[PDB]
RNA sequence: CGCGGGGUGGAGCAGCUCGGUAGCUCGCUGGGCUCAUAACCCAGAGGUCGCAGGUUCGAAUCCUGUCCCCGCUACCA
RNA sequence: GUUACGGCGGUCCAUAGCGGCAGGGAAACGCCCGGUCCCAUCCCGAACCCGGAAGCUAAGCCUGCCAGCGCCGAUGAUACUACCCAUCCGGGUGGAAAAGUAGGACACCGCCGAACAC
RNA sequence: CCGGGACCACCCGGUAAGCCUGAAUACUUCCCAGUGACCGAUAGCGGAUUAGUACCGUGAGGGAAUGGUGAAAAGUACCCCGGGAGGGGAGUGAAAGAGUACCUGAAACCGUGCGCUUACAAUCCGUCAGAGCCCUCGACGUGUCGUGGGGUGAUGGCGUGCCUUUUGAAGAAUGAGCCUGCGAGUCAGGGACAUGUCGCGAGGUUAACCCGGGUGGGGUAGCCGCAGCGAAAGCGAGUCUGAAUAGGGCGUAUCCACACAAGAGUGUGUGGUGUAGUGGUGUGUUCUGGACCCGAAGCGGAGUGAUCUACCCAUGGCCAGGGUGAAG
RNA sequence: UCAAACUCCGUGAUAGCUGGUUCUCCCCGAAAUGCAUUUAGGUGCAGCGUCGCAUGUUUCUUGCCGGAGGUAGAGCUACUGGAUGGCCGAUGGGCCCCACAGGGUUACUGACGUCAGCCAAACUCCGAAUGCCGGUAAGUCCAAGAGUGCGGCAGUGAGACGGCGGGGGAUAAGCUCCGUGCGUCGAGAGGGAAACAGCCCAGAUCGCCGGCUAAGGCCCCUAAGCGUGUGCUAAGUGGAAAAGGAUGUGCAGUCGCGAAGACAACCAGGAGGUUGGCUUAGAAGCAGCCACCCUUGAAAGAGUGCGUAAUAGCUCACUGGUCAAGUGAUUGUGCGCCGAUAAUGUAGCGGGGCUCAAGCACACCGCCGAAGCCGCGGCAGCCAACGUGUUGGCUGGGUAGGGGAGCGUCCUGCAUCCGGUGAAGCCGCCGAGUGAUCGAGUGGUGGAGGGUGUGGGAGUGAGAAUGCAGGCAUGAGUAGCGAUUAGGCAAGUGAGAACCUUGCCCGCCGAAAGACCAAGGGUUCCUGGGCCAGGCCAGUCCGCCCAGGGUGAGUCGGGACCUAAGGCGAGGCCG
RNA sequence: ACAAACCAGUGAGAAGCGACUGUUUACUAAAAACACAGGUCCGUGCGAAGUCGCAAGACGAUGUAUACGGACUGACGCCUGC
RNA sequence: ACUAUAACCAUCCUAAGGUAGCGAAAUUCCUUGUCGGGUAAGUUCCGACCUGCACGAAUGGCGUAACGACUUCUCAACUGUCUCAACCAUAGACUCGGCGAAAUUGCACUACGAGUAAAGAUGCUCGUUACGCGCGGCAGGACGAAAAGACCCCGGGACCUUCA
RNA sequence: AGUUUAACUGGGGCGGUUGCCUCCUAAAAUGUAACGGAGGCGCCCAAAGGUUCCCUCAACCUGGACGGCAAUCAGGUGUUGAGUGUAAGUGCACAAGGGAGCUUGACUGCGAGACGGACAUGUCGAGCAGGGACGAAAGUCGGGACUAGUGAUCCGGCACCUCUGAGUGGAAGGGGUGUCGCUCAACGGAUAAAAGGUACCCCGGGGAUAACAGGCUGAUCUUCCCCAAGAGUCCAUAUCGACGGGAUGGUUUGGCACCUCGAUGUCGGCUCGUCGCAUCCUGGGGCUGGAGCAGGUCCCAAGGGUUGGGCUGUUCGCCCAUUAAAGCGGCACGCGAGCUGGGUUUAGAACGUCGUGAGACAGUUCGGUCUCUAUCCGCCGCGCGCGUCAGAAGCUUGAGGAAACCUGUCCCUAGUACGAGAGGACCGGGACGGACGAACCUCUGGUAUACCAGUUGUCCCACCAGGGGCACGGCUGGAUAGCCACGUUCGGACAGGAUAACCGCUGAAAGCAUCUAAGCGGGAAACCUCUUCCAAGACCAGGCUUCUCACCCUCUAGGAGGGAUAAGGCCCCC
């Protein structure tokens, strides 16, 4: 006999790249995702592939806003 | 069969502690 | 070891999805020619390739289990 | 500063909702009156927009009443579980610890403004 | 007319279709004289020897092995055993433990003799303990003791060869009968990379070649460094992209201090410090080469083979005896 | 020798394949994964090792903190799906009013909805633990010999079993494929497991006739206990096994009854109605079935059964008595029984043997037990300290593999030394070194070149290649000693006779095993002599060895005569 | 016991294959395979065709279509269809 | 018109649809087809049927006298092929003398059982058995010797074929 | 003529697959394999892109002309179940879903920083400028809600460029920028260019990988078993025992691929056996729907026995006759250094079929080399040595082993019991037998290599005669011994003990009952004894007896060594 299956796609390495508290530079990829399981918030932008990137430095802060899970970047105050 | 059975039940010993190579 | 393969009016055969499936011959029905078949005329009549699913709006049509007589099935040591 | 108040926001956006049954119209929010003007309907001055102030809080909005429906929901226990012990007991230790249930939880906070107060 | 890298023009160079021409250059069958951090008889030529011999093969062709007495044969007269061989005496000799089997004379292997052990025992053959026996060295005292050493080993415990290759082998997977010899990362190159070391040093170095009976002295042609960026033209501590003073790429050896900008990750200017390569050589990898060694089946070139065998050609020979009984 | 001969050459053909690759020690030490591959038993790169350089704790562990997840589990009236039973009841099917519509009604189906209980890797209103990312404080910190970057050198890229989570598979495989800061083997000895890579303990620097321990064990084999206490087990369970069967036994209960006499036994009674009805020819306390009553009364069952053709008779359940207290039914557990069942020989404790436990459970006490730890001593590596080499700490299993340092051999430059008053080599003795190995220590043999130091260079180390050559073993004093005729006696010779010689017999061939030629061989012929090789034994013999001799042709066979096939082939043609 | 020993056919029936005698895998196959005579087809008009050869040249053949070569079939009989 | 088949018909396709003859065949899987013969009994054999998996006319078909070291079957005779083996001789084997190999070989004072183990043990475990050494014999094991498995696979060759 | 003709593959082939995307597997980061489970892609859109603005569905209810469940209309409920170009997932109702307007950012130059990461690939990207679109403006726009929709490099083409231009000016050609051309789909893409066979095969390798066997597993298979719906006149269990369930065994087909591919020879037969019992017969027994004969079923029992033939290579099977019975299995489907070699499984040839073909066929057919001196273990036998506390001898015991162990027919019991009859016994006695084995050779029979006779041919002994040699002892006919079977005789036992299944007795625990727990018995071809044989190497090396039961020498007389002897034995000899 034979199987009509056997295929699979390449793993896309989606996920969260910078978790809560992680200090990140601007443009840093925080979240690789397909939709908006994580939404963009403060100083975070959404790319064409629904990827979340920091628009400014800071520490990643995961929050909520009207039920949506959000990703925010809180500034790191210099001494 | 008897041979495999005995060899597996050998693992139920105070020394082997319920594990042996090839069980 | 295992694989494979078309179905449609009563019979035999066609027809691949612009949104219907149907058409041919034979058969059958009614009439006519004949003193009574064949050959002629038709109002001629006649089927859901079985169900499930489409991206379906809708599938004979496309895809899968089934629909199943199918040519080839062949482990060579 | 006080309002049965008008906006702008916030919350691990439901303890906030829905549905009650009884209420309010000070300014305001509103329905509401008309389409002459900007503007508008793939038709409609319904809407959008504009001009207005006839009457009405009926509704929206707002206030009080609530466990009726939904939402929240511990504790403790259980399941599951990393490590460990244990010669099958998936047994047991010390840690973590749900879901469901049950007990119980019914909006709050800020800024401005309005009328009044002052 | 030809060439100047299609081609055309200009310019330049040259003057084909005719010939000759030494030296510098390549090589060594052979001859002479020499050298070797070359071999030294399983090596070195295949061949130190009967060597392209013997031998193999029809043939082409393949292709061995075999060195040493001693300083001098003085090579053992003579006697004895013996058919002889071989030996013992005697002699030669420095030595016959140098006797044409001969320098030294290992091992495997074969014996002989002495000691210990072994014929009730299940043995990867040994190891550890160890009785008893024997030998030995010392001591004391006279044979028991020791800081002992050796050989044997009763007996007890433990104990599954080596290599290769494997997940894993004592392995009933491979290879090896044993000993002795031989038998596998080497060599060349201004090679490549890295590293060490030495020399010189913003320079380093020569190659070919010349002179030197040498390993030494000359030899600047080149090579690598010394400025990069760019496709390139080109520009140059800048350059490329680009419309950009607008950012980025590469580069400006590195570091220090200051100043100014920034805190998008730090940058920009100034000053200073000032950049380290190159050639020898060793080592490790690597490139081209057979490239650590052995190993195919097979491919190609040129030849040898039909004296075996297949077929054919020419010329000869052979087929007892007995039957059957065609045509004519 | 032929699916394309042989020989030489190309050629040292090439082989992703197999094999082999030679001395030592010190330190470190893998992998068997990913991606790609005319790739899958190869290779490149990455990962993992080593070395060096740079950096320096960044690594790692623990605590705390910030975080994202959707697994386990759970839940589904929270979605998609599945799905059990009810309830309602659309819907249809029928019926009746009977048309056609509209009606009621249902033996039925019965959606939707609802009540309750459920399920799911590709379902999730939920949701862990862990793990992961980050931060932070500490720990280790004379060390993990960490981590990162660069570069030199790699090897690996066939993994295995086991624990856990999982797929495939029959939720079989000593199966296969994955995951697992999981382990071990690999590459890891030692102890236990009878033996037994992967299980347990524990990671081997060396030595010791010292000690403590781990796992596991303490009757004898076999070191330590026929240990102590309380119970259990009767099956040698222990020292294999299922569904399931089962008055095994102990414990813990629970319930019914019980001296107002229980259960058991012994004595006496133990129904009428009535056949309660159907059914069979019948039905009755009893083929079979519907109901499953009342009545005298203690007790009487719609009868407890037998016997029964139905009945009877039989005893029953039940009632009363005689003696006389436990009796009966069940629940869970701790040990057990059966089920139990292969084939060389006990053979499913490792063995003896064990219940007078040497078995099981729970406690307790000691001991044995390793290359673990400690102790004493030695060595090495890394590091530190202090001093210009000692001490101390830590470490020291190791395959591929990397790095470092060395032994030995030969040839050599230089400098030295030894040696015919005996070098090397070989054999030994006595010894030495951490190792390869050493011996300017000794003797023997031997006879001429060697040693040492410092450098230079290597045909530099073999145990393996079904390696090459030589020599020698094992088999083994074994097979065989070569036909199908057959040898024997006497005498001789001679050192020696089965074999030679002579004679006599016997036997074999006799289209041959006789005689003659050719081809081929080449002196093998003859005479004399010899006997260490050869002859498959021996040998006085020989086709062997040595010497000498021997082959005479007009007519034989050939040339000088002839031509065949065929060959060479002047010139020539062709190339 | 008279073919005396030695020497010296076994025979019969039937089927398959191949007609036959022969040939063959030296060294595991002797056969139903090959060949065979016979048949058909095709080619060849002649230093033919075909073949060896670069060519010359040679065989074919000192032959000339009743011959030569190649292919298939394989005595003979009946046949050889689309 | 019983049934069975189908002389016959319809339809589709084809270049044409296999004629004669043969047929479980040297061809027939099913299959030891079925029937008959032979046999006491016959998967073989003979004859016949035709449901020809998958005959077929010069890759000739169907037959065929004669022929065959062909293959198959049957029968007579014959026999040690057998029931069922016995005896005799000879050559070896055996013994003595003489000469004197070989393949093989990691070793060796090379037991058996049940186990264990790279899953089949002389070599390990627990036991059992066994005085040491030979001679003739047998061949169960030493996964015995021999030949770097030919089957299979991988890799590479060679030769062969062809519309590569 | 040179070459190609892929790989993965639970051996290979065939089949299938090869890249990309989505989910699950996947173990809550990422990632994660399998010929694991499901699907999709190799596009589409000039709007289905951008922007601004607006809207919110599906479903359900109700009312409505055609109009129906469902077209379009109205109202209501409805927070999302619709729809999102297209697979799935993640998302999207704040809308990324629906609609309209304007448009082309489906831009140029660039890109801080990141993701992912063997490498090559791939991905996001704020922000600066240019010049634009939309928007009042903020702002958004470098294609699409996202993730697939694709192809490295080489080579070459096209357009543009203030690059280069082989002496110079040009040109060619090259270069840059943009872009095009590969189902190179085996999708990291050997070549621009490529299919097959080998049984004629070869080489290198592999137990990395199949066939045999072994091993594991035990789906399957086999042998049992649990429940018992039931069939059985009734009655579940005399017997069969469904649906279902649990196991044994390891013999079947298989799965795995663990030893072995520098060789583990294969089926079947022959020979030789050996083991187990899941027993075919014989033996013992329980139950019976067992009257008796005969059975059925179950239990115990492995001592012995378990035929010869036809067909087939066959195992198996069918058949023929028989039998007491014609067992099932293991031991490398026992056994090829023991045999065969018919088959399978080389090379030849042929048929059919497949293939253009070479060739192929778990299709057929005819034919077709079976090597080896036994070293070790083992086994069968036989010796040598030593020991068994002096040497010797005779006779022995029997631990412990080996062998053997089979069975029928007939008769009487008795035509009795039983039974309507048919038919027909148990138990117990007797005879005769088959098969097997041992011993023996009187018989019979075979053989007879120095017997006798006859006889053929030939040669010889001079010849006749008589004889001999040779021809298989020449052939024939006979044949004592020995060897032997076809022959003779004998054997297996009887009896006892202890037991299995089973039958019980006495009897409790448990006032009864109970084959048992204490006790006692019976009980089978199995076991031990008995019969035969070997046997004290029976290392506990035995026992009863008998014989010799005695000298010297040397070492320094310690413990030995040597010699000569006895009893006796050995060798030589017959």
Structural determination approach: cryo-EM
The nucleotide whose C1' lies nearest the CA of A4 is I16
Calculate the CA A50 to chain-centre distance: 8
Nucleic strand E under 7 Å from the C-beta of A13: no
The nucleotide whose C1' lies nearest the CA of B14 is D87
Q: Count CB neighbours of A64 within 10 A.
A: 10
What resolution (Å)? Answer: 2.8
In A1-79, where do the E strands start and end?
Answer: 15-16, 23-24, 29-32, 39-40, 44-46, 52-54, 58-65, 68-74
Nucleic strand D under 7 Å from the C-beta of B6: no
Grouping H, G, I as helix, E, B as strand and the rest as coil, residue B13 is coil
Residues A35, A12: Cα–Cα separation, whole Å: 14
Burial class (CB in 10 A: 0-12, 13-18, 19+), A36: middle
CB contact set of A17 (below 8 Å; sequence gap of 6+): A28, A29, A30, A31, A32
Contact A53, A29 (CB under 8 A): yes
Contact A77, A63 (CB under 8 A): no
CA-closest candidate to residue A26, choices A18, A37, A36, A34:
A18
């Amino acid at each position: 006999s034979s199987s009509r299956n056997g295929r699979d796609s390449a793993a896309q390495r989606l996920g969260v790249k910078r978790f809560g508290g992680q200090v990140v530079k601007a443009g840093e990829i925080l979240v690789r995702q397909r939709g908006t399981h994580f939404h963009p918030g403060v100083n975070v932008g959404r790319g064409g592939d629904d990827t979340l990137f920091a628009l400014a430095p800071g520490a990643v802060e995961f929050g909520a806003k009207r039920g949506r899970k959000t990703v925010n970047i809180v500034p790191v105050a210099r001494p | 069969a008897k041979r495999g059975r005995k060899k597996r039940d050998r693992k139920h010993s105070k020394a082997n502690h319920g594990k042996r190579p090839n069980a």
